[PDB]
Amino acid sequence: VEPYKVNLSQDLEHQLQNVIQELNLEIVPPPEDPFLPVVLNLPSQRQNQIGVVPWSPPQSNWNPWTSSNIDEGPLAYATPEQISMDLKNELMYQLEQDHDLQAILQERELLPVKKFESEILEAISQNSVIIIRGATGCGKTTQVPQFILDDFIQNDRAAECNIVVTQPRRISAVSVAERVAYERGEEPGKSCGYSVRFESVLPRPHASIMFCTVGVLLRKLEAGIRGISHVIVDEIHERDINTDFLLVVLRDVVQAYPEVRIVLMSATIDTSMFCEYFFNCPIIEVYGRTYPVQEYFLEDCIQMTHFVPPPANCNLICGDEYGPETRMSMAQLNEKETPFELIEALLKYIETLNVPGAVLVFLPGWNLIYTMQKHLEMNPHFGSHRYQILPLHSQIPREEQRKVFDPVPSGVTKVILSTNIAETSITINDVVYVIDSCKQKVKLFTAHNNMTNYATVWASKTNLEQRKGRAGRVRPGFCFHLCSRARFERLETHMTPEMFRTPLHEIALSIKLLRLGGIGQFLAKAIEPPPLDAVIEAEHTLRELDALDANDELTPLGRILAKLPIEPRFGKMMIMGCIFYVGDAVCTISAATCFPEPFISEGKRLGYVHRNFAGNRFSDHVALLSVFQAWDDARMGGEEAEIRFCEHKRLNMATLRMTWEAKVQLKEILINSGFPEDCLLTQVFTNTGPDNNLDVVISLLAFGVYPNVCYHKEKRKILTTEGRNALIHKSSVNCPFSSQDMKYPSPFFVFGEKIRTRAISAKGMTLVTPLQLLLFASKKVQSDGQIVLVDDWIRLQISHEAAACITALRAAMEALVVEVTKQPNIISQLDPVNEHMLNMIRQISRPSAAGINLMID
């Protein structure tokens, strides 16, 4: 397209030149002829040792969860024996007195894992490492940590027991901690606790179990595994990347500290790979009753329901022994869609069998669960009189999650519309019927075009077998697979482990913070090492950020980014926010990326109230900051004022509260890295009037989400950095409500995630000026004297000197970030030479700097 004309005043051009001259910053001079354009853009003590995370056993005067001495109260001097006796007696009394708890223990003693209690405890006592293998629903997760704890309590060694249980999912760590507390007559906070990203309930310091995500454990290993007797690594068969990484750390720990106890727990898969990795450790097999399950495929499903679709490809392939209508009907179904209407027809077929039982439906993600749910409540046959239809995904509230376990009024059918959470991590009771979409949801990132694909993909044969088996724990069962018999044949046996297909920059920072050695050298020792290109891309990413120096050693910037649990690029954006004294707002934007949107839109275009949060800034990120300011104001009135605020504005309160908490924790980590309190205060802003603080926040957001820049042609059509076409996401404040066109005062936009569906979509969009483009959303800039070319995709008609001056500001800003990370309290100093540079960036963040007044039309 035509080069875009930047309207830069003479006053500003000279101000830019003066600041570059005052500070003696290097500029590239204009070119000689327009056919040779010029680019405007221009060590610590290594070791090769393989470090080991140190280990030390529980100690009576040590709180292993807070990693500090017990100083106050009786536990500071109390002997192990005193502590063990008290806890032993406390437990014996509770079990004599509580009739409801006695009934709960009776349920426990009937779980299949119960009969193996002795064999498991003998195996753990005799071996540094063991594997416990058995079917989903035996009681590995809920029972085994209690068996170990109760073994120590009942043998007068309560004080010698502290257990870490890792789960691959946030929802599993929380849920399991709530379930195990309930099984012990408690709420989390006594014998059991949980620690996940941005939320914890710490257990008591003694004879306690902490359920956590691996990320939390790795972030807390900076001082070693101190005061812990057992590490239980759960659901290893999921090949969660962080679990694979932790298995490398714990193998080194075991070797150097054989008194530690590691316990790996697996579904029924081949565990020889893990077994061999951990020096041929014992495998304790665990099993109970299972019933046979009749399994059906798409063609079987079409025949027994007489179903007829509306008006390579394994739906055109069907065996001779099926009817000509089955073949014809199957052949009409797109394999990339899930057939909602066939599922409806399968629930009705199940009614005719007259055997009571719950139906578990496996759907890839929340998008198809919502769609299947709405589809059913359209037909009044699927109302409360006959049907309890419950969604199960990680984002439904925990109140709603528990309801999938509740019994149901006689003559009502429980239907769980579930993600693969219900494949191996939880067991819904009363399940006799499984409908399997035969799909998985996976996050695929591609670094080269910065494309996120929430892709719907074929499941493995091993997933289909596990899904089939969820129908066969109560009585003989049925599994209705919605893929052809000819698609089944082409299925891989296992999923690609996440280590093969996930970015490694966060794992790389953890390796460096924990001093485990070289990134490539440590990942080479993984059970299944990641591919070379992923390691090369991680090192390259952390080197562009200046998280690693020339020697690939941790910079002081690296150390901060490693300690912040968000994307490193966002960590660096928060340091820059601190330097500009807008820390709180940049911490809010970073925290919000870890949680679903607070707006309850229901996959439709935002209406008036949601759009009003945007002001005149054409920015989803400003909409979010304005929501958080209004919500925090309405919260002063108390809980009911907060609930009413969130109901009247259609906002998810739980999302607003978790984001705020996450923001509080991010800020605490910067405080502890030496950042001054007063660069992180909440600052009132307006989303319509002049606001230099908000101008700077939007500049810093361009940096954060780079390389996500786009150019708006017309309507919803945008051009991405690959020269390719894309759509403004329906959910954006920048998406036209109807046919009235938006009059953007700039065509340039930054966005959260570039999404591949059928088209390329920009989601969470913020308008930026051409000046902000050049300062923070540009890696490479070539000038011919008249026209500059930005990252080989878009052209500005702008002065050469202005573009070179803005590029030199970016470099000055990078060099200040390096200085500030060595010595964060220089933010306080407000040194005059830095202030001169910062004030010029403050000035070119103004909409007025690029000829724009957002208050006019």
Segment contacting ligand ADP by CB under 6 A, of 131-139, 317-325, 576-584, 813-821: 131-139
Member of 7, 21, 44, 66 binding ligand A1BKX (CB under 6 A): 66
Alpha-carbon separation of residue 624 from 21, 356, 396, 766 (angstroms) = 39, 47, 21, 11
Q: How far apart are CA 245 and CA 309, in angstroms?
A: 46
The smaller minimum CB distance to ligand A1BKX, of residues 228 and 592, is found at 228
Does the footprint of Cl ion cover residue 296 (CB under 5 A)?
no
Q: Is residue 570 a contact point for Cl ion (CB under 5 A)?
A: no
| Nearest partner of 338 among 317, 316, 309, judged by Cα | 309
Which is nearest to 362 in space by CA: 354, 352, 372? 372
Residue nearest to ligand A1BKX (CB): 195
How far is the C-alpha of 815 from the C-alpha of 834, rounded, in Å?
Answer: 10
The pairing of strands 68-69 and 62-63 is antiparallel
Alpha-carbon distance of 561 to 568, in angstroms, equals: 5
In the bound state with ligand A1BKX, the residue whose beta carbon lies nearer, of 227 and 847, is: 227
* Among ligand A1BKX, ligand ADP, Mg ion, none, residue 64 binds (CB under 5-8 Å by kind): ligand A1BKX
Q: From the list Cl ion, Mg ion, ligand A1BKX, none, which binds 114 (C-beta under 5 to 8 Å, kind-based)?
A: none
* Residue 136 or 732 having the CB closest to Mg ion: 136
**Cα–Cα distance between 825 and 297 in angstroms, integer?**
65
* Collapsed DSSP state (helix, strand, coil) of residue 779: coil
Q: How many residues bind ligand ADP (CB under 6 A)?
A: 14
263 sits near ligand A1BKX (criterion: CB under 6 A): no
Stretch binding ligand ADP (CB under 6 A), from 19-27, 58-66, 138-146, 215-223: 138-146
Site for ligand ADP in 421-460 (CB under 6 A): 427, 429
141 binds ligand ADP (CB under 6 A): yes
793 binds ligand ADP (CB under 6 A): no
503 C-beta neighbours (distance < 10 Å), count: 17
Strands 283-286 and 439-446: unpaired
- Largest Cα–Cα distance in the chain? 93
CA 26-27-31 angle, to 5 degrees, is 145
CA 823 vs. chain centroid, Å, equals: 31
Residue 212 interaction partner, one of ligand A1BKX, ligand ADP, Cl ion, none, beta carbon < 5-8 Å per kind? ligand A1BKX
The minimum distance between CB 236 and ligand ADP, in angstroms, equals 12
Choices 388-396, 705-713, 715-723, 828-836 (CB under 5 A): range interacting with Cl ion? 705-713
Question: By rule CB under 5 A, what string of x and - marks binding of each residue 653-692 to Cl ion?
Answer: ----------------------------------------
- Minimum distance from residue 638 beta carbon to ligand ADP (Å): 31
Binding status of residue 139 toward ligand ADP by CB under 6 A: yes
By CB under 6 A, residue 669 contacts ligand A1BKX: no
Q: Which does 574 bind (CB under 5 to 8 A by kind): ligand A1BKX, Mg ion, Cl ion, none?
A: none
194 touches ligand A1BKX (CB under 6 A): no
Please give the Cα distance from 808 to 27 (Å, whole number): 7
| Nearer to Mg ion among residue 111 and residue 331 (C-beta) | 111
Indicate the burial class of 359 (C-beta count within 10 angstroms; 0-12, 13-18, 19 or more): buried
State yes or no: residue 210 binds ligand A1BKX (CB under 6 A).
yes
Q: How many CB atoms lie within 10 A of CB 96?
A: 9
Between CA 22 and CA 402 the distance in angstroms is 65
How many residues lie near Cl ion (CB under 5 A)? 1
C-alpha to C-alpha distance for 615 and 510, rounded to whole angstroms? 40
CA atoms in the 13 A half-sphere facing the CB of 120 = 27
Cα separation, 511 vs 49, in Å, equals: 12
Q: Give every strand in the sheet of 38-39, ordered side by side.
A: 4-5, 794-797, 787-790, 781-783, 38-39
Per the CB < 8 A criterion, the answer to whether 578 and 712 are in contact is: no
- How many whole angstroms separate alpha carbon 577 and alpha carbon 592? 16
Q: Which residues in the 173-202 window bind ligand ADP by CB under 6 A?
A: 179
Mark 285-317 as b/e (b = at least 16 C-beta within 10 Å): ebebeeeebebbbbbbbbbebebebeeeebbeb
Residue placing its CB nearer to Cl ion in the complex, 675 or 706:
706
Select 217 or 727, whichever has its Cβ closest to ligand A1BKX: 217
In whole angstroms, the minimum distance from the beta carbon of 562 to Mg ion comes to 30
Closest CB to ligand ADP among residues 130, 841:
130
Partner touching 216 among ligand A1BKX, ligand ADP, Cl ion, none, CB below 5 to 8 Å by kind: ligand A1BKX
Which residue's CB is nearer to ligand ADP, number 136 or number 845? 136
Q: CB of residue 528 vs Mg ion: minimum separation in angstroms?
A: 22
Selection from 271, 237, 277 nearest residue 254 by Cα: 277
Decide if residue 140 touches ligand ADP (CB under 6 A). Answer: yes
The site map against Mg ion for 135-154 (x = CB under 5 A) is -----xx-------------
Binding site residues, Mg ion, CB under 5 A: 140-141
Site for Cl ion, rule CB under 5 A: 706
Residues at the contact surface with ligand ADP, assessed by CB under 6 A: 111, 136-143, 179, 402, 405, 427, 429
Which parts of this chain interact with ligand A1BKX (CB under 6 A)?
64-67, 164, 195, 200, 202, 210, 212, 216-217, 220-221, 225-228
